[PDB]
Write a protein that binds this ligand. Structure first.
Ligand SMILES: CC(=O)N[C@H]1[C@H](O[C@H]2[C@H](O[C@H](C)C(=O)N[C@@H](C)C(=O)N[C@H](CCC(=O)N[C@@H](CCC[C@@H](N)C(=O)O)C(=O)N[C@H](C)C(=O)O)C(=O)O)[C@@H](NC(C)=O)[C@@H]3OC[C@H]2O3)O[C@H](CO)[C@@H](O)[C@@H]1O
Ligand code: NA
Length: 154
């Protein structure tokens, strides 16, 4: 099969790539911002250039509001991405998705840590981590949790 031990995955959770970005959302919205459409066009290029690969997506919500509500919101966030891709010709069978609600806070990557003096690589944006922060710091963290993650798979 593969003639080597596992290498680095092309995904948004562990590493930062200019050409494979997280999708971020407004508070209580599943809408694709103009920036999100550019990011999805970059993903469509990867899908069309590599016709056999699939994309696994995971959609999320920030700590505010009930668990069940946030699960539904995360499903709508995944669906908006799937609908944009399928509207551009991507076969639905090439995409898998899961809505995690607010159950999986994001881990701060080296790029996120470079951009914010208060965040360090490896910090997990849990409710307990975000709770004692300033209103501005909470807004940065909550925004980072309102995202869709991607991973390129077979
Ligand atoms: C049990 O779980 C909830 C309550 C549920 O599943 N009910 C659904 C059907 C529902 O419609 N509930 C909402 C809950 C509204 C809510 O809590 N919204 C969140 C939205 C949070 C979104 C956020 N977590 C994100 O990731 O964008 C929130 O915190 N809003 C507050 C009041 C606010 O506006 O600041 C309603 O009453 O309209
Ligand atoms: Na930092």
């Amino acid at each position: 099969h593969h003639h080597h031990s596992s290498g680095v995955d092309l995904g948004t959770e562990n590493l930062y790539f200019q050409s494979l970005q997280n999708i971020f959302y407004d508070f209580d919205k599943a809408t694709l911002r103009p920036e999100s459409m550019k990011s999805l066009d970059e993903l469509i290029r990867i899908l069309t250039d590599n016709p056999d690969i699939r994309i696994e997506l995971g959609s999320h919500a920030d700590r505010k509001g009930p668990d069940a509500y946030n699960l539904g919101l995360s499903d709508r966030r995944a669906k908006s991405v799937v609908d944009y891709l399928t509207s551009r010709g991507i076969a639905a069978d090439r995409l898998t998705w899961k809505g995690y609600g607010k159950s999986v806070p994001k881990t701060v990557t080296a790029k996120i840590a470079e951009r914010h003096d208060f965040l360090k690589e490896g910090d997990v944006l849990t409710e307990e981590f975000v709770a004692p922060l300033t209103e501005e710091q909470q807004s940065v963290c909550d925004q980072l949790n309102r995202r869709t993650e991607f991973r390129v798979i077979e």
